[PDB]
Symmetry: D2
Subunit: 123 residues, 4 copies
């Protein structure tokens, strides 16, 4: 268990800030603030992580969601990040994400962006 | 708001079952049971949805996570689904997902599966 | 070998038309015409397929690319489809695709769409 | 046009080697050698690029395919890379890829890996 390793404040290559608490039972709760896009201030996030990972050197699988509505803005979209926590001197969360926008059915083909974010504890 | 449209039991093309409650504030909570893979019985899920969607005919953006640990099994992996709810006689949730396994750093290149699930209220 | 099974005209769920020739050596060459997006008329495609698939009932892995420039339009983008051919009465090509647009480095995070197309020999 | 900027030998973060020729007309032809996976020696690749990119500082969209069959091995799979070329002192190709394996229909849900490769002209 990486409850203590995951809990805290993380930053990605875009300058976004992810603040998370890891529960003993697998929960992830916190706030996300994007440095880019149709976003301002903090948004709620929730997710899950493997609270009993393999002990063979593998990372810890996890994921979370942000719906891009808060008191300031509504971007009618949601991002999910799916990835793994890798602990140690230079801890990281390595993720791939899917960002779906609400669309009409005629536009659904162009609804979903894909990308990759790497989070560190410094910067 | 689609709190009432989303809340309930959904089934995908693989025969998996998704049971969700939508909160007024954007939360999604419930259980997932996969018909395939290294899985048995129910697993916790959490996620978020846009609680004030566009009124122009667009769908409602949402996402959720399952970490594949429960009292029965641990598949050292997490799936995130990112998609949209489309209401009406034949309501659907149309998703794309990312399934990340915990790996060593040598294996990280092969850590993540991608696919697509369509959920309906019947079958 | 599925050289004869793959070669010919295919249609997807959007009404796009894919015309391909499969070479003995693994090549795929042809034209694509999209029913959606910043596209008109035919565009060049090239790709590769497994010319000696497994004989255990598995599908035949393949992929191809279209750059969205022709004599009519330039959408400064490219799509790659990665998938498998499944032969038999109701033959199909089942794909997932990635559509990357040229962007500035500030915009690179929003450069790439993801989706899924299923091609059949009728419709 | 980036025919001269793209043509040549590129290396990714895994130590794989991509050797490509860019044609005046949008073609990409060459060989790929993976440092990882069920692969040995060189494999054929083909693809396409935007031969008349935007002049506003944007990158050049491109993609290519490798089917993992050569005279040595057959991994019954294909990878497609979709991305953009960014020119200048530290030129790069920034990609996302989809790796589909031939599967039975029961296994199709687990057929496709997703990841991201960054190619440079040194290392
Ligand atoms: Cu206010
Ligand atoms: Cu028990
Ligand atoms: Cu003309
Ligand atoms: Cu030999």
């Amino acid at each position: 268990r990486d409850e203590a390793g995951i809990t805290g404040t993380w930053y990605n290559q875009l300058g976004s800030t992810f603040i998370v608490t890891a529960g003993a039972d697998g929960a992830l709760t916190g706030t996300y603030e994007s440095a880019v896009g149709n976003a301002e201030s903090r948004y709620v996030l929730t997710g899950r992580y493997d609270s009993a990972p393999a002990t063979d050197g593998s990372g810890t699988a996890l994921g979370w969601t942000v719906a891009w509505k808060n008191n300031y803005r509504n971007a009618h979209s949601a991002t999910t990040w799916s990835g793994q926590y890798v602990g140690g001197a230079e801890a990281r969360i390595n993720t791939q994400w899917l960002l779906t926008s609400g669309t009409t059915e005629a536009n659904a083909w162009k609804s979903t962006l894909v990308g990759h974010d790497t989070f560190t504890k410094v910067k």
